[PDB]
Each structure stands twice: as C-alpha cells, then as structure tokens.
A paper describes a structure:
Here, we solved four structures of cryptophyte [name]-[name] complexes purified from [name] (Rs) cells grown at L- and S-phase. The [name] cells grown for six and 12 days (corresponding to L-phase and S-phase) were harvested, and utilized to isolate [name]-[name] complexes.
Two [name]-14CAC structures closely resemble each other, containing 14 [name] subunits which encircle the core complex. The 14 CACs were named [name] to [name] in a clockwise direction when looked at the lumenal side. Eleven CACs ([name] to [name]) constitute the inner antenna layer surrounding the core as a closed ring, whereas [name]–l/m/n form the outer layer covering [name]/b/c. Except [name] and [name]–h, all CACs are grouped as four heterotrimers. One subunit (termed chain-s) contains one transmembrane helix and binds three Chl a, two Chl c2 and three α-carotene molecules. Our structure showed that Chls a322/a323 of [name] are in close proximity to Chls a616/a606 in [name] and Chl a816 in PsaB. These structural observations suggest that in L-phase cells, [name] may facilitate efficient excitation energy transfer (EET) in [name]-[name]. The final overall resolutions of maps of [name] [name]-14CACL-phase, [name]-11CACL-phase, [name]-14CACS-phase, [name]-11CACS-phase are 2.7 Å, 3.0 Å, 2.9 Å and 3.3 Å, respectively.
Numbering used by the authors:
A (entry chain K): 10 to 42, 51 to 86
B (entry chain J): 1 to 42
C (entry chain O): 22 to 125
D (entry chain L): 2 to 152
E (entry chain D): 3 to 141
F (entry chain C): 2 to 81
G (entry chain A): 11 to 189, 192 to 754
H (entry chain B): 661 to 733
The structure:
Amino acid sequence: VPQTVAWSAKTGAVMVLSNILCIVAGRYVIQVKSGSFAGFGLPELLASTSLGHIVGSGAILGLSYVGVL
Amino acid sequence: MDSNFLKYLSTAPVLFTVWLSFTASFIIEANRFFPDMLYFPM
Amino acid sequence: LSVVAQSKSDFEISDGTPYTLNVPLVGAASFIGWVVPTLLPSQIALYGGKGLSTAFFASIGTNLAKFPAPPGMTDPFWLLCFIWHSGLFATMILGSIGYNGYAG
Amino acid sequence: SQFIKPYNDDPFVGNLATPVSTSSFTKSLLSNLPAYRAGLSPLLRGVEIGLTHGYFLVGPFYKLGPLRNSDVALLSGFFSALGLIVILVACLTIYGVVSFEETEAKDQLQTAKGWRQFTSGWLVGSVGGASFAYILISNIPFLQTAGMSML
Amino acid sequence: ETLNLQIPSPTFEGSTGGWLRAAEVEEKYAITWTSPKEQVFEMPTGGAAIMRQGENLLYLARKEQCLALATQVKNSFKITDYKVYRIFPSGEVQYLHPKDGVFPEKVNAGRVGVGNVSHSIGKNLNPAQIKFTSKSFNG
Amino acid sequence: SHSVKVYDTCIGCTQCVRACPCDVLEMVSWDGCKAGQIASAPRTEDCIGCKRCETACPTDFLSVRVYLGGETTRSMGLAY
Amino acid sequence: KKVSITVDRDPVATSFEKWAQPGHFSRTLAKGPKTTTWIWNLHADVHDFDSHTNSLEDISRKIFSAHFGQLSIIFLWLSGMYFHGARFSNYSAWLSNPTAVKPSAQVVWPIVGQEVLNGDVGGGFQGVQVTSGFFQIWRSSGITSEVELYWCALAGLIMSGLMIFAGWFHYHKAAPKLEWFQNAESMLNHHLSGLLGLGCLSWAGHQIHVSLPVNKLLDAGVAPQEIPLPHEFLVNRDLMAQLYPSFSKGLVPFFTLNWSEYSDFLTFKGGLNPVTGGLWLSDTAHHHLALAVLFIVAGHMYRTNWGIGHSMKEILEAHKGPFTGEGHKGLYEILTTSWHAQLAINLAMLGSVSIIVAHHMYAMPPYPYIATDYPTQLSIFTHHMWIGGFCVCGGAAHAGIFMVRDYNPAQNYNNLLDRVIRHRDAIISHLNWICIFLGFHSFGLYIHNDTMRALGRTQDMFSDTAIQLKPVFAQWVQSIHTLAPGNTTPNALATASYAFGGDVVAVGNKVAMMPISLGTADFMVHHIHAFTIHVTVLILLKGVLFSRNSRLIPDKANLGFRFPCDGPGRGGTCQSSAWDSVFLGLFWMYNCISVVIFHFSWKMQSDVWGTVQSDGTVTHITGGNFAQSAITINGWLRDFLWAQASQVIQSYGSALSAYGLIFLGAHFIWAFSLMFLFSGRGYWQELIESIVWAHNKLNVAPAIQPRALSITQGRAVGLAHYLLGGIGTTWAFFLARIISVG
Amino acid sequence: MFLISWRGYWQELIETLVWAHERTPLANLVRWKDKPVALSIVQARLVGLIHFTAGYIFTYAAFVIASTTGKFG
Ligand code: CLA
Ligand code: CLA
Ligand code: CLA
Ligand code: CLA
Ligand code: CLA
Ligand code: CLA
Ligand SMILES: CC1=C(C/C=C(\C)CCC[C@H](C)CCC[C@H](C)CCCC(C)C)C(=O)c2ccccc2C1=O
Ligand code: SF4
Ligand code: SF4
C-alpha cells in the first residue's frame, strides 16, 4: 500500500503552494472572466482553489508515494 | 362519468382487450371448477 | 520509401499542393522528445531498474545475441517494444502536427 | 493547407486527388511500374509482370499444397504454379479476343496486337519466374524451410 | 441556343459520386442555370456545392441527375432558368429540357401527341388474338 | 426502351408530367376532356420505368400506362 | 446567467377528448379510417413526434414527458421484481444455502396442469427458476430479509408514481421552453457531476456502510437473522470498527489526505473472493468512490454561467487539420437542434456499453455466488449482448433519420459530414472488400476443415493438431495481464480476471472462473466475429451514407427515410431506402450476436464451467470438445446444437416443459415470419379481393376496407417475427440446457 | 439472401464496386464488356427459389439415405 502520512505543516506547505500556483495560473489561463485585481471574482477564486485542492491532493499523495513527503 | 373517457373505452383496442380478457377469463374459471373435459359428458 | 528534408524539394503531398514533410526534424525531435523522458527509471520487473527506452534498448541486444531465435511470448521485449513505439508514434504524429502546422 | 482536391482540376469527375491517389510517392511508383513505365513494349511489360507473378506463385503451392510433406513438394508446387499460369494465360487470351477490335496499333496495352504481345510476354516470364524460384528453392536449404534451418 | 462551354462551374471540392468512364465514351449531360446569389445547394451526386452568382454549369452522367437538381433548384431557390443538354463524345451537344422553350406541364401549340390511344385501357386486345400476328394489342 | 401509353380517359391533370423524373411526358392540346389537354409520351427512350407517372394518375384505371420492355443504359438508370 | 430556467405554464389542457379521437396527432390520420392501412399507420407513426409537429419546442416537450413515462414503467418493473422476491420467492432459504438452493421468484397458478412448472427449486419451495441475478444483487446489497424487500418494492412504487406525475406535470402544467433543452453544457455538467458522480458516491456510501459489514458477516458464516440491522453499523461505530478497524479513526484520514489508513475497506485486491466467487466488495467500494471523484471532476469542464469552463462549440471548431476541411464545425448546431442525431450517438454508445457489460460481468463476476450460478451467467451475458446489438442498429436507424430529415447542406459545407458523403464510394467499396476477404478467410477456413475432415485428411486441416492458426496476439495480451500483479500494477494482489490465466476459483465444487485458453478454434471464431460485425457495419453504413441520394436514385431524400422502392424501373429499386438497410442490418446483427452467444455458451461449458474434485482437476460440462470440434461446421451442428438440444426436447413432463414448448413455439414464429419475408403485397391484396367478394355475397363486408399490409409493413412484420422466433428459440435452448446441467 | 434482401440494396453496392475498379491502378487496365448490374427482381426470386429448393432436396436426401443406411431398420 502506498505510504501516506498524517497531516503536518509539510502537507500544508504543498497544499498552500498548489493553491497559489493555480490562483496565478487561473489569472493567466481562464479565458472568460492590477494582475490579480482586474476582473477577479468568487467563481474565478473558487475554481482556482478547487484545482489547487485537486493538484495539491495529487502532489501530496505522489510525494508521499515516492518518499519526498 | 366523462363521455370522452367512455368514448375512449369504446375504442376497438380497449374493447378487444377487455372482451377477450373476459372471454379468456371464463374459460379459465370453467376449467378450474370443471377440469379435464375431453368429451361432452354423455 | 523516401524521406523529404525541411529544404524545398518538388515533393507534393497531393495533386497540386507541395508540402514540406519535415522527416529529419520531426523524426529527430520526436525520437529525442520521447526517449529522454522515457529514461525515467522504475524498479519494476519489466523495466528491471532502467527506463522504458533503456530496458527496451537492453532487450534489443539480448535478443540480438540469440540472433536466429525470436523473443518468447513472456519475454519482456514485446511489451517494451509495443509501449516504446506507441509513445514514439504518438510523439511523431503530434510532432508532425506541431511542426508542420504551427510552423513555430 | 488542404490535402484533398478535385481530380485533375475537375470537381465533377467521380474521383478525388488524395495523398494515396496523387502524392509524388504514388505517382513515382505508378509511373515506374511495368504496366505504366514509358519506353516499354507491351511484350516487355508482360515479361516483367510475368517474372514477378510466376516467382511468388511457386511458394504457396509448395509450402501449403497437398504434397507439401512429401519429397515431391517442390515438383508438385512448380507444376501447380505452371497449371495456374496456363489457366491464367487462357484468361488473358480470351480477354483479348472479346475486348479489342483488330487494328494495326501494337505499342499500347489496350490493343488487339498489344494485348497479344503482353500475353506472350506474361506466359514466358511467368514460366521463367516460376522456374527461377524452383531452382533457388531446390538448392538453398534456407528457402525450403521458413528460415528454420538456423534454429 | 448552343451550350456556351465557357460558363463557370459551381464551386465544388469534388466527390467520388461524379461521372465515370461511360460519360467520356458514351454521353454526358449538362445543366445550366442563372443564380441571383452565391449560395449553397446540394449536389445530386454527393455533398454540397456553392452556385456562383450569375450563370452556372454542371456535368452529370444521367439525365435524371440533371433534372433532380433542376427540381431542387426550382423548389428552394426559385430558379426556373435551367436548360439541360445531352453531350456526345463526338462534340455534338443536344438540347433536352425544356424541349421547346415551355415546360412540359404547360401546353404548347405544335406539340404532337405521341403514345395516345383512342380507347380506354380496358379495350385492348387479348394476347391470344394477336398471337403469331404482328397486330398491336392497343386495338 | 420502355413503352408508355396514354389512354383517352386522361382528364388532363398534368400530374404525371410533373411527377416524371426524366422529362418523358408532356401536355399536348386535346378536345376530349374538360381540361383541353392530354398527356403525351414523346421521349420514352429516356423512360427509366419508375412508374411515378402511374402513381400520380388519378383516373380509376391509369390513363398513363408504362410497359417495361428492352433495357438500355438509359432505362437501366446506369451512371456507369 | 444565460443558463436559466424558462417554462410555459399550463401549456396543454388535461382533457380526455383527444383520447376519444384516435389519430388526433397527425393531419392524415385525424380524418379517420377508410382502409385498414389507417389502423397500422396509426401505430407506426405515433411516437414520430418530428413527423407531426414543425416546432422543436413541442417536440422536445413530448420527448421529456415521454422519458418520465418510461422511467415510471421501469420503476414499476423494478418494484415488481422486489415484490416477487419479497412475497413469492425462496430468497431467505437461498441466503442460507446459496450453493444448494436455486433462485425462484415466480410461482404459477394451478389451472390446466401448468403447475408442473412449479419445480423443486429447493428450500421447501416450488416455483419457476429465475435467472436474472436479483438474488445475487440483493445479497450484494445486504438485504438479508423479505421485510427489506417489501420496503424496496414500496420505494419503487413511490418513484413510479413520482415519475408519471412529473411526465404529466412537465407536459401539462410546467413545460420547459426550447432554450431550456438547448443547454448542452449544463446538462452534461449535471449528468456527469450530479447523476453519475453523486450516483457512484452515494452507492459507494451504501457499499461501505451497509454492503461491506453485512457481507463480511455472511462470508464469515453468520446466519442472516443473526446479523445486525444496517443502521446499527451506521450508529455503533465501535461495531463497525470490529470488522474494519480503520473506522476507529473516522473521517480525519479522509480530510488530512492520509488515505492509506482506509485500506481495510478501500482495497485494490483484484481477483475473486474465494468464499463467494465474486469480486471483493472492498474493491467495488474503492472502484465506485474513485469513479465518483472523476465524474464530479469531469462535470466541471463545461461553461454555464460563470466564465470558467469550456465552450463545446469552440472545442469542436478548433479541431481541424489538413485532411478534413473545416473540421468539426457545425457539429454543435447539429447536436443541439436534432434529437435523432443525439439518439443515434446515444443508442450506439449504450449498445456498445451493453456489449461491454456482457464481457466484463462473466469474466470478473461482481456479485456473490453469481459465478457458480451458471443459468444466471449465461442469461445475463446473452441478454446484454442482444440489448447491445439492437441498440447499435437503432443508432444507424436514427443516423439515417437524421440524414434524410435534419441534415441541411447549407450549414454543413466542407465539414466532416460533407466530406464523408463526398467519398462514400471509397468507404463502401473498401468495407465491401474487407467483408469479402473476411468471409472467405474466416468462414472458408471452416469449409476447408469440413471438407478435409470429411475426406479423411486430418493433417490438412487448420487445427491445433494440424496446421495451426494460433492467436498469438490474444495469447500475448493474456500473458501480460497475468504478469501485471506486482509488475505493471504493482499494488494489485491478484489479476483483474482469472480468465487471463492463473488459478481455478471453485465455489461449492463448481468453477467460478479459470483461464480461458485460446487456440485455433478461438482464432477462427474471433475472425467469424470480425466478419459479421464488419458486414453489419457495411449494411448500416451504406444505408446512412446513401440515405439522401445514390447513383441509382438522385433524389432519395424526397422519398423519405422509409419508402418501399422507387418502382420496377432502373432494373428495380426494391428496398432502396435507409429504413431498408436497418431492416437488412438487423438480420446480420442477429447473425452476429447468435454466433457470439453460441461461442460463449460452448466455450464456457467446454473449457470453463464444471466441477472440481480431488487432484484439483476440473470436469467440464461438455468435456473440452471445443478445441477439436469447433473448427468444423459439422462440429457446431453435432457437438453444439444437436448435443445440447437434448435437454429442451426431453423436457416434457418436467418443470422445464415450458422451455420445451417455447422451443417449438419460437420455431413456429420464425418459420411463419418467412411468409411475410418471401412474399409480396400484390399477391395478398388479390387474395383479399376474393375474400371480400364472399363477404359482399353475404352482405357482411366491412366499411374499413381490408388491405394487404404495406410493402414496408410486410418487411417489418417479417423481421419482427423472425427476431421473435430466432431469439426465442435460442432463449429456450439456452435456459433449459443450462438449468439442467449447470 | 435472394428472398429477403431485394434489388435496391444490391444495385447501390455494385455502383461502389464499379467506381473502385475504375479508380484502382493496374486493375482498371481490365474492363468489363457487360456493365455489372444487380440481378433483376424476377430473377432473384428465381435464384432464391432454386437455392431454397436445391437445399431442401440435398438435405432430405442426405438424411433419408444416411439415417436409413446407418440404422438398417
Ligand atoms: C411490472 C412487472 C410485473 C410483472 C411482469 C408481474 C407478473 C406477475 N405477477 Mg406481479 N406485481 C407487480 C409487478 C409485476 N408482476 C407489482 C408492482 C406488484 C405490487 C402491487 C405485484 C404484485 C403481485 C401479486 C400480489 C401477485 C402478482 C402475480 C403475478 C403473476 C400473475 C399476474 C396475473 O395474471 O394477474 C392478472 C390479474 C388481473 C386483474 C387480470 C387483468 C387483465 C387485464 C385485462 C389487463 C388489461 C390492461 C389494460 C387493458 C391496460 C389499458 C388500461 C385501459 C384504461 C385501456 C405474474 C407472474 C400473482 C402471482 O404471482 O401469483 C402466484 C399474485 O398473486 N403480482
Ligand atoms: C444533478 C442534476 C441532475 C440529475 C440527477 C438529472 C437526472 C436525470 N436527467 Mg437531467 N437535467 C438536469 C439535471 C439533472 N438531471 C439539468 C440541469 C437539465 C437542464 C439542462 C436536465 C435536462 C434533462 C433532460 C432534457 C432529460 C434529463 C433526463 C434525466 C434522467 C436520465 C435518465 C436516467 O438515467 O434516469 C434514471 C436514473 C435515476 C437515478 C432516476 C432518478 C430520478 C431522480 C429525478 C434523480 C434525482 C433525485 C434526487 C436529486 C436524489 C435525492 C437524494 C436524497 C435521497 C439524498 C435522470 C433522472 C432525461 C429523462 O429521462 O427525463 C426524465 C431527459 O430527457 N435531464
Ligand atoms: C507527445 C508529445 C507531444 C505533445 C503532448 C505535444 C503537445 C502540444 N504541442 Mg508539441 N511537439 C512535439 C510533441 C508533442 N507536442 C514534438 C516532438 C515536436 C517537434 C517536431 C513538437 C512541436 C510543436 C510545435 C512547433 C508546436 C507544438 C504545439 C503543441 C500544443 C498544441 C498543438 C498540438 O500538437 O496539439 C496536441 C494537443 C494536445 C496534446 C492536447 C489534447 C489532449 C489530448 C488528450 C491529446 C493526447 C494525445 C496523446 C494521447 C498524448 C500522448 C503523450 C505520450 C504518451 C506520447 C500541445 C501542447 C504548439 C503550441 O501550442 O505551442 C506551444 C506549437 O506551436 N508542438
Ligand atoms: C431492455 C433493457 C434492459 C433490461 C430489461 C435489463 C435487465 C437487467 N439488467 Mg441490464 N443493462 C441494459 C439494459 C437492460 N438490462 C443496458 C442498456 C445497460 C448498459 C448501461 C445495462 C447494464 C447493466 C448492468 C451493468 C447490470 C445490469 C443488470 C441487469 C439485471 C438486473 C436489473 C436491475 O435491477 O439492474 C441492477 C443494476 C445494477 C445493480 C448495476 C447497474 C450499474 C450501472 C453501471 C448503472 C449505470 C446507470 C447509468 C445512468 C447509465 C449510464 C449509461 C452510459 C452509456 C452513460 C437485469 C437482468 C445487472 C445484472 O446483470 O445483475 C445480475 C447489472 O449489474 N444491466
Ligand atoms: C431509446 C431508444 C429509442 C427511441 C426513443 C426510438 C424512437 C423512435 N424510433 Mg427508433 N429504434 C431503436 C430505439 C429507439 N427508437 C432501436 C433499438 C432500433 C433497432 C430495432 C430502432 C429502429 C428504428 C426504425 C427502423 C425506425 C425507428 C423509428 C422511431 C420513431 C417512431 C417510433 C414509433 O412510432 O414506433 C411505434 C412503436 C411500435 C409500433 C411498437 C411495435 C414494435 C415491435 C414490433 C413490438 C415489440 C415486440 C415486443 C418487444 C416483444 C413481444 C413479445 C411477443 C412474444 C408477443 C421514434 C422517433 C421509426 C421512424 O420512422 O422514426 C422517424 C423507424 O422507421 N426506430
Ligand atoms: C448461408 C447463407 C448466406 C451466405 C453464404 C451469404 C453470403 C454473403 N452475404 Mg448474404 N444474406 C443472407 C444469407 C447468406 N449470405 C441472408 C439470409 C440475408 C438476409 C437479410 C443476407 C443479406 C445480406 C446483405 C444485406 C449483405 C450480405 C452479404 C454477403 C456476403 C458477405 C461477404 C462474404 O462473406 O464474402 C465471402 C463469401 C462467402 C462466405 C460465401 C461462401 C463462399 C465459401 C467460402 C465457399 C466458396 C466456394 C467456391 C466459390 C467454390 C468455387 C467453385 C464452384 C463454383 C464449383 C456474401 C456474398 C454482404 C455483401 O455482399 O457485402 C460484401 C451484404 O451487404 N448478405
Ligand atoms: C400473410 C401476409 C399478408 C396478409 C396479412 C394481413 C392482411 C394481416 C392479418 C392480420 C390480422 C388481420 C390481425 C392480426 C392479429 C394477429 C392474430 C395478432 C397480431 C399481434 C398484434 C397485431 C396485436 C400481407 O398483407 C403481406 C403484405 C406484404 C408482404 C407479405 C404479406 C403476408 O405475408
Ligand atoms: S415510368 Fe418514370 S420515367 Fe417513365 S414516364 Fe413514367 S414517370 Fe417518367
Ligand atoms: S412494388 Fe415491390 S417489387 Fe415493385 S419495385 Fe416496389 S418493392 Fe420492388
């Protein structure tokens, strides 16, 4: 079974990074909507952080799998 | 009772389904009470 | 068959349309663009600790040692060969689409 | 860019100009095949086609025929190919009798004489190509098996 | 009257449904019509073509294919300006439809009736009566 | 070719002529019906034998009658 | 917010008046009958909504409410399946002895001696043995009592009432507008996320909290009435943590991303449960949980009301290359303005999925004790192959109805449809050549073998013993899947299916699954399959591609989708419509699926199913005769049809005498169909004339003048009785055979 | 096949085969003298009837002779 670890600040770090990464990506790649202060609303923010919890969950599970944690 | 609903029940498929279900039903009942009648008893 | 270069020959893909097949550039870039990621090792019995390209490149030579004899059904050569070429054909297809069409 | 166009600039003819149909590679192969190659007499067109067809005919008869497991397998396979070649030559001859009116033109395939030329070349080449395959298989043990002599 | 061979053809990308060797060795049919617009129509032999504003010209293998297009061109584009020709490989161009300038469903003087039988269909002769005789069954 | 006949029961409705896919039929002048016109078959070499004319005809028995005969390239509807 | 709900209120009046006026929905039929053709034309065109109405809005409204009516019937059907299980079944006896009791949920009344059909199915019970696999579903669900089956039956009835209310309500009270139905992004978002995603997630929750604890206790051996009720697992988390100790940690491992804690009940075992011969339900729970996530993820792809998402039009119009002209341009407009184009896709996909279901469920048996219930394994494979084949042919039926009616060349210039129609001769000539090659090189191998075996030349046959046509690619794929556990699926413990290779799984001394070896006979019959599928594609594709026009008929679209001919001219144009290729392609579908189920039935009996005893050897049902006898037609005639028809013919006087009667009755219906298929309407109208005369003689002629059926209806009646007869014969033959021996 | 499937399906296939022969290189060198057409409406009835009838006779003759031979009784 792929090893997973109990929540630590390291798990938080990956999640925070991934959420911010997607918030910046969402400002760039969301085609229909002051780098983050133009046209930024809740559906844009709620979508980029939804992909952050998808990317972050995948990254956390993968880094636990290989040993990086 | 509604006359358009009675005119619907007078349509050929309903009467055909009802009459032949009624007809089938008293053959079934006649063979329940009086089974195995190969001949007219005489 | 034949290969056409990036430079202009009189080759036409159809009746009247000349089209530069970029067989050197696409084949080289598709090969390298697929082989280098595929160097990623894996401690799986099919790979044996190598990558998919390298386990495959290892399995060409082992079966070439027994040159008349073909690789067996359970031999890892066939699976490695199929997977390597599947990605290679896909990168060639996508590379031809990317290079010929977008031109950059 | 578009790879499919009407056939020879004509939008209303029953054909298309597709890469399989009209690429430079296709045009090359078609133009250089014996049927379409320039500078070839119909007799020479028949010979080159006949040599090709007769040569490959020997192999399926030899390897998969009724006498394949006998030592007369190659003899039976050649004679089977020879019988097919003779049957096919009758097919060629009767096609010429019923398809072409008699005219002096003889350098085209689709003429009465040109077909008779092509049929003559095909029979000679087919027997020649089948005979060459017979000689090669008879002498070389690799060809007698499927390459199985090495294992 | 004669077909002006130089009339431009509707923009078409080609199809396999067009004419074959029998058109270039036996006969070919052509249809011309005037279009007020540069509009898409359906070819009888396949997909869609675009007729050019002004005069168009097509070549088809069957007479029925030219008239099936004529029916469509008159029912959806209200073009009644269509002339159908028969073309032989000798170069001879034979005007076909409408044969005397007026459509067949409209009467015209100088049309002679062909095939008209003076009695009703039940008044024909029995086959036995005309056996081993050249006499026709229509009376 | 096919043989197409028009009998004098034709009421001159022109429906056969409109239904014909190959322009075989046309209307000629007459005086035996109220419409003053009768169907005619001048171009039966182009008749494919579809019998769309017979379907279109409204007289009790068909005024237009198609008799399928010898087959040709035209009457077999061959585009090849 | 351009995605909005819009409804016309009180559109159509709930009146019985149109009920009393049969044919009210079309202008032709509403003026009443004058010939008997009117009666048949009434039933033929009734659900052809786009033939009655011009507007896409009223058509869409009729479809939406008719889908509720269909749902109401399915819920009523499901509710009755539960009620017969609750009231007229041996379910409770079967729970105690799944390997001894035969499932039965249908009991007949004693009337004319028909009570012989109440055979001894076991458990102190008499009834008709049922093969639908409901008992195995209910045990997989964790039902464990007839009381819970009554509550499921009521739950179906309440749903059945709610769907018929909604169909009435959404047609007569609150009918959505066309702009509501034309929300393809919204519908896909909800049907991926909401329907499929929350469907899987909720079912995973039932599996985890009810199916997993109840079935662990059953497979441990606890008696069904000794098992705690399903809600005591929901509340007493200590009791659930006894069976699965990971529950001691609750939902903190889920939220903190420490998912490995849940490996007690979310496994990746693979293979089968040794006790029941079914899939590990801990795997199915993880399967549905993982499927649920990516269906909820997939349903966030499309753009609705907030700028995030894809436009499906933009995706399609961007995919165009140098071979394909304008590409997928105009396909969005087709699929949001044509119901038939949507029905053509969805029928072909649903039929394909039903064919996949047949293959996946026999090979990876999902329910407890369904693998060794061989009547069920044969029944649900055969049923889902027929549903698939029928639905696939209706996909081409409605692709033809689209092309004839909803296709507009003006909106489809130089796109993918325009380009397909413009080289359809190249497609149909290449498919035609493949089908000739395939028929010669698949069925001709059988004819070669019939002749060689008849001639005494067994060394000249294509056989494992003689010349060998081995399926090396299928054998190689089988090798890979047996090597996959620990190698290319490293955390899997067993193979996805034992059919690929591996152990023999035995339950109650009967084989659940075991490797299905492939030989020359398997090579031969697989190419038989590829031939019959390709010809079926050939007949149906030629009908779709030539539906509007041909070289034969230049104006086929003006005659419609369904016409009998365009006369005896052009040599004869009988059966030239697109409807007539669906008609001809349902025969070749019938031919295709008949060989598939025959291949399945003979191979499973000969090489898979049977009994295990000491030394672990397996005695198969027909003793491994497939390898050396499925290579000749005489082998299929003798060793499959003749040998296995013994049970259905000798069934008279038993509980299987019903199958014996249906065997003969379906042979009758099939033959009777050939009266309609080989005959023509003109004979039958002239015969009716003399019959009308005798009525005129007695002054009893009807005012609805009798007619022979239409040319199309003779074809439709012939095909329907052919299918009813052909399939009904195999149904009786399959069911009496496998109930007796398996 | 001759009794259930009728002419229009078969004539349209044959038109795709006529196209392919003319467009295939090395094969369009060979030309038919008679244009290939689907069997007529009446002819297909006769062909199907002959096949039906021939199959009927050969099957029963094989059965009535072999079953009697095999049993001798
Ligand atoms: C939907 C699927 C379905 C199916 C196929 C069956 C099938 C069956 N059920 Mg089950 N059943 C179902 C659902 C189903 N049931 C549901 C949902 C319930 C719960 C209410 C039941 C409850 C139930 C009981 C309680 C019993 C059965 C029984 C039976 C059997 C005999 C039924 C019979 O002859 O009664 C015939 C009854 C009649 C009144 C005859 C009616 C015939 C009319 C004429 C039909 C006409 C329809 C009409 C014309 C439609 C148009 C309407 C009109 C306005 C025009 C049969 C195996 C019996 C059984 O198994 O006994 C051992 C039995 O006792 N069923
Ligand atoms: C989450 C939202 C959602 C869900 C679940 C569905 C579900 C369904 N839709 Mg869709 N639909 C939706 C949103 C949704 N729709 C939206 C937003 C639109 C507008 C664009 C449409 C437009 C639409 C059309 C036009 C059609 C459907 C149809 C259908 C049915 C498909 C047949 C089927 O599998 O039913 C069987 C499967 C089932 C699960 C039956 C369930 C019955 C109920 C309605 C499901 C939901 C119940 C409830 C939410 C669950 C409560 C849970 C609670 C106990 C905790 C199915 C019930 C088709 C149909 O059959 O019409 C009736 C149809 O023609 N829908
Ligand atoms: C497998 C390798 C691969 C992949 C994934 C891509 C992907 C892409 N390329 Mg690249 N390219 C490749 C190899 C590849 N290329 C090579 C070898 C060459 C050199 C000859 C180029 C040269 C090239 C140029 C010059 C340009 C691109 C561009 C693009 C982008 C859009 C156009 C395109 O090709 O659509 C491909 C579309 C997709 C991949 C997304 C669709 C999603 C589906 C699921 C496709 C999946 C296909 C396949 C299964 C993936 C295989 C992966 C692997 C297993 C082989 C896209 C991100 C263009 C671009 O956007 O600029 C940045 C551009 O200008 N490419
Ligand atoms: C005339 C149509 C018809 C009929 C009468 C049946 C009858 C039956 N089916 Mg089948 N089925 C059909 C069509 C039909 N099927 C089609 C078209 C499909 C493809 C989707 C399936 C797929 C299918 C599966 C996968 C299963 C059945 C099962 C059953 C049996 C139990 C019925 C039950 O309670 O379902 C119970 C069904 C389940 C408990 C599981 C269903 C799970 C699927 C994946 C749900 C999908 C729902 C979703 C809305 C559909 C999306 C379709 C997709 C293309 C988008 C019964 C023999 C079951 C069986 O054989 O048990 C022995 C079974 O497990 N059916
Ligand atoms: C989701 C599935 C679905 C849907 C909604 C439709 C809907 C439609 N189809 Mg399509 N079709 C489907 C599946 C579907 N079909 C499948 C699976 C096939 C393959 C067989 C077809 C083949 C098909 C053709 C060939 C045609 C249609 C037509 C039609 C339309 C008219 C329906 C009508 O009035 O019939 C009324 C319904 C009947 C007359 C029912 C009688 C049918 C059979 C003979 C009775 C059933 C026998 C029964 C199951 C077993 C009896 C038991 C026995 C022992 C007594 C309608 C648009 C027709 C059309 O013109 O559309 C424009 C048309 O010509 N469909
Ligand atoms: C046993 C009955 C039977 C047979 C043999 C055929 C045969 C065929 N059908 Mg037909 N068909 C049948 C019943 C049958 N059908 C029925 C009942 C229907 C009713 C709906 C149809 C409807 C139908 C349609 C609608 C279509 C076909 C098609 C085909 C062809 C498939 C291609 C093929 O396999 O070529 C190979 C040929 C065979 C397998 C025939 C047997 C030849 C074997 C190998 C022995 C050959 C011996 C050799 C020639 C002997 C030479 C010497 C001798 C002359 C002395 C083939 C001609 C399709 C077609 O023509 O497309 C290609 C097609 O579209 N059929
Ligand atoms: C027998 C036959 C008829 C005659 C059959 C007729 C006129 C229909 C007779 C049906 C009776 C009148 C009612 C049917 C009732 C059945 C006893 C049950 C049928 C089941 C559903 C219709 C309810 C044709 O008209 C015909 C037309 C074209 C090709 C072949 C044939 C053909 O074979
Ligand atoms: S049979 Fe057809 S082509 Fe001939 S006259 Fe009548 S409608 Fe015209
Ligand atoms: S009426 Fe019957 S036989 Fe005549 S063409 Fe039409 S379908 Fe064929």
